[model samples]
Target: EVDKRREINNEHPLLMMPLYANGEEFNQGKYTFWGGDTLTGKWENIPDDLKPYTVIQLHPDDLPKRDGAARDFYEHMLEEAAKYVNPKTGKNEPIPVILTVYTAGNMPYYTSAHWLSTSWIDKMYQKYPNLHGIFSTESYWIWANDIENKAADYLKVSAKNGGYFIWAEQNSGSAIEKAFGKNGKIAFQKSVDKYWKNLIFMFKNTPAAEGNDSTTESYMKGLWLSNHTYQWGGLMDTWKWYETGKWKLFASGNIGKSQGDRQWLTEPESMLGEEALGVYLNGGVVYNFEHPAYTYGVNNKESLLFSEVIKEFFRYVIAHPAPSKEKVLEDTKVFIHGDYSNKGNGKFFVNVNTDREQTPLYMTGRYNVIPAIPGVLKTDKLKESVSSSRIQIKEITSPEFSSTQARKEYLNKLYPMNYEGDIFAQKLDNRWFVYNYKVNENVKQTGKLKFNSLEMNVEFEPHTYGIFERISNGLKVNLNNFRTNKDSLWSNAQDANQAKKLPQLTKKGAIKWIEEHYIKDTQFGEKRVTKIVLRGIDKLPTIHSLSGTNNSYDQPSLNFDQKNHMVTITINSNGNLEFELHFLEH
Candidate 1:
């Protein structure tokens, strides 16, 4: 028997796999279907190939009908699974197992067999050391009832055994409507939301007591979801909460065996664009049902190939780091939104466009303004100032590959296996821009002007999506354009030249003063500065590296007055810069 406890990485997203002992040949092999027809393979014994899989689900037949039957079958399966090793970790570690139980609507039968399953789970840890954690799923749901109370009871048991509970739902929207009639849809959605919220609360706040060895940490490891298609819209909302922490998003695509067209996978670009967009942008973990009974042509060779490709794509996503927080853009003309994070001395940005129509997008405002120094008393002699500053920007464009077929074709050429590099790094034509700007606190900076502009072109075709990233001192901007590409001044050199002919700063717009202060706990620990970022100028130094520093002022465009503690910068036709000055204590 494998040890009941194991190290789990909470940061990794959930990926579920359903297992059937006497199931189809494919079910007995590796977690991912690499290639070939699953029907043609032999299933004499459980294949020992290693693959990436987060959770293992036990089919109903594997579940015990009698009291002792559970331990017998579960132990056997655990013993067999122990032979395989994880390819990624190269360890024969135990994975979380979710057990299925029959529930009549909101209530379980509560018979001796049901009790036996729970009781066996309680003792399984001692009998089989391979128990990573225990989880439960309901057979079906007709209507919402006192499931919360029952779910709480299950949580208690799971806690006692140092395990967790998996939330289950039927995705059939029509069935839910029929279950409660016209009003059932909204009612079920609300009830499911509340139920999961309460469960999360208990899992987070509840402490382990007598008969319960589970602490918040142990219980958290068992967090899983078996949400079918029920209330798909509401599930998206729940996913937002899940993003806060603790819960793992799990979705199932149970396409039954059918030889007809599989639109979801085959024509994902046009058919599943919106749905896939929502799922991915919101961080939903998805799994497919390819069992013989519920295969939706997925067991076929071609479907398996598509599944492998999408699976790799999802893996890349899971490995991508989440943003620190989302930034709010005041302008809605182009729907600019993205994740931003400050790295003390530097910043990173990702911007996405959420609009469908392609239009020119502009960003013009005073950003990265530092506050006054802390711990310093207000005095007449103290003044805010600027020091030296540098700005770096990278523009990624996919003008040639805006459609699904085009993007896929590009990927095929770049990575034959379709195992493309980081989604953010592939098919991106990167251009770097670096420049310096002068800042004067006394300038009485005011007004607004278009500092920089980009064509709201499509990154992923047929979805009106595009993204670009920038890294600069104290600020980074990554832009995602969700709008289709259209005409833009920046789209052509002639148009851009025409725009450059216009005034750099219109009469209505004036230089803006932005200040930032860094304070330490001690009275003497304070840093103050004033700065401004400018765009639409030329003759700026371009840095090719990911990050760099520049201090030389040999060029005529930059001037420094050491005696007056002042610096000034002039621009040509196209460039960007951030001028800064630091206030020092006498």
Candidate 2:
């Protein structure tokens, strides 16, 4: 049986804000309240009402005093939490808890104002095994003056305490400058990277200390927080900050505002398309600080819609794993394309069309292009990767709606309430190739040509996006020309738009086998080998084994002549075939 709690933690990193049972403002509806006011002993029992979520967030105000009161509060909360059984494990497991500490202005440092001081927080983690992470705001203020020292102190403590630290409200570069000084902004960022590296090192090396049984390795990973439009001055600047992957945790939208003060749900189209899509594209967790009470209110149906959309988006992200690394292609014309390399030998790409009108995108490469919707409903089996072998090409059109109401209606009409219509591509090239494209909706289709001077034209609908993957087989492929359809009527259509046209490839060159280098760890220190995996061979190729190295001490094994194109190696006992070669005298 799968450990549901662990799976939930790994897949969904975001948590819902907690509500108190005794708080007058929180107990207005039938919604389950999991927390209590620490001052009064009026804590709620753990019923089956709150079983859907695996993580919860608690505010500093949820606990009353630093003395026995706070300890008792946590003890009671944990006892109740354990009552909710995990259906898969058939055991009572506590939900992961994130304690939020919101600090005030830049005065005595943000850490100084933590409702639960470091000492008390350390004690809480030692006392409660379910406490997984901490969330705090105003980090810019805390790390301003003594940026390096303060950052070290905070990260060291977090590493020792065995819980992740989330620095909320880091704000923009200007805000960072306001807190730090003229060069304070860049200095602050440098300190952050330094401390992050230190934390990673300590987590791997340090053992468990007093009051903490688990090392930092057991804790959650670090997260960086930012605000939405009102605080960060809209999505573009937020995107600029996100371009730097230093702050992996991206929390957007408003906090501390009453139900009436928030504008996200009221303007769903812009918020979802501009702000939320930006966050999704940047690989950040989406969260809002709005109270659950507001969502449960009778007058806040739009708020409920926004929450549902967020949940749907979360589900989509949970299904799709994050890529190991990503790069934005330079030659993209009509759409912004980001190339992602998976952890293994797989690659993924995401192409977003931020334009208002429908436009076509073109690329020249060996790829299997397929149209896909991002937030579509998930089945029992989740899709691992978007490759030619897994999915089939299908025609799906997205409807355009103008107003928020119309958008909301259109949103629900889709298979899933929140769908990201994207395209997926898999590269079949064995050589390293650069991707390029050009788009013009009004251009007419032209015939293809042969040879190295080949050009392909593909079209993309306006305000849309797609994704693809590229495999580098050590070959150099270049894109010569790109053109898009120049028709304006496609942009003005009301119903589902036509599917994007995929590019065609014309091959002319003979097989060009290139040498590839790979380093591997053996019982010794490191070993470099020229390795290649040949596919679709009826039998292994022949090669003559040789031994040569520049250094007399290095007895590197070599196979196959340097002049020969074909090489051979004995098949391993495990049914694996590979060729290993060594070169001497560079």
Candidate 3:
């Protein structure tokens, strides 16, 4: 049976308002701002009807004047905008105006690096609920060393209890190149890559990253290119590096295959920041795009091609529109990829296939397929819908439909480590490797052991969490320092910290439970595995149930896999698992 879908008012089309920051100086004009001045008279000049979808971009330097004249300008424009009527409301509802701050360069700038500026922005949020959202587009410049502290400070002032946005621009535009210079290129790219890698990987192993500190950013700047050698070289290589890793790629376990297109746009990190304002303010997803724009700046040909492709993509989304009310509830994802084979204007294709679907699926969105260059052929919408036991297929190449869906069952399953699977252990190089195992009771042995390498998956289902404990003594482990990537978890100095901090485990933390329990013993010439025994603890003998999904209270459950280093712990719902654990046996 088809899932019940909320009615969509087709008449009220999805709004699309493009914003331009005059800073580009495309024709080499002396524009003070990188994009546009948010506090200038230009804002008041915007048509009221377009205000709901309108977006304003503020550069880092522009921030110094924000609290002074800019704040007044913003309020006055908002008051004037309130006189407009919302088509859906039929009342003179004020239109939502969004603010996007660009600080991808000059990190120490007031709005880019300082925590105090973020606090001021939060104050503004409390004072103005109608303001669509505020964003920082350069926080990616910082590394793991500084992310948490900055994030914590930003969230405190944010209207939300504790949340903020982090945006990573993928391009080495003139502004960034001038600031960071040559020696800083590799470090900057590595920092950006490490940031997301840690964020994604930590989400599964350590839930700490999921807190306010984990607001993710995006692969920005690839759509545009700069004229300088470092601008073009460093930024171009960055895109190549990310593509090599395919930042958005993931596999669904059902069909034992991967899902999503190689290049579909996921929620832009900054977009998440905007969404937070509404959810935090009204207690749900009540926010709209205050200011939205096509961030396109690339080499001559690439720019034109991408713009055309984007136009088509947008057209499709607006036309078919995703089942927004319904789409949010499913474990669904969409992926996109760009092809640069064309000399002048290469094209990007949206693959609509899922690793989870057992049958064909359909998607709707606003998409257009117009080529800007003369010789370039206007691409047609590619469409396909098929059903397969292993994977289903649905591909559309059009600008009319705005949204599309992919089954999760066909995606490739990378190294997984759910603790619930049957495989518990493996032997390698005269040593035993542990997979996903839990410690339920006490074991009888202690032995010399070393973990040469470790990888796993993670699933934090809201209420429940995942963990690995030694069965022999009911010993708990903490995964504070593990390094995380897009889809894989690796053990390095940080992961070793998990073992070092074993005695410091706490229940109040994100990880609250383990899958299987075990014990190990070590002697001069041999190692031993025995049933672990827990002393003076009655709860230790009982089969402690991992938290389940609480439908009424909306809690998450727990799930874990050792082989892939993946675990899903949710509240109230069943967290299915497929895990394997390996340990040395004497």
> Which ranges in model 1 have alpha carbons more than 4 Å from their true place?
1-10, 21-53, 61-73, 83-92, 101-116, 134-140, 143-149, 170-280, 283-309, 323-452, 459-586
- Expressed as tens digits, the lDDT of each residue in 79-117 for candidate 3 is 544455545567765444444432333244344223235
Please provide the root mean square deviation of candidate 2 (C-alpha atoms, Å).
24.0
Q: Which has the greatest lDDT?
A: 2
Worst 10 residues of 2 by lDDT: 509-518
Q: With candidate 3 superimposed using the best TM-score fit, by how many Å does residue 503's alpha carbon deviate from the native?
A: 62
* Candidates' C-alpha lDDT: 0.26, 0.27, 0.24
Q: Candidate 3: deviation at residue 324, Å?
A: 5.0
Q: What's the C-alpha lDDT at position 179 in model 3?
A: 20
Tens-digit lDDT string for candidate 1 (221-340):
112111111111101111111112111111122222221111111111111222222233322333323221212222232221122222333354455421111111110011101101
Candidate 2: residue 47 lDDT (0-100): 23
TM-scores for candidates 1 onward, in order: 0.37, 0.38, 0.29
Per-residue error at 467 for model 1, in Å?
A: 5.6
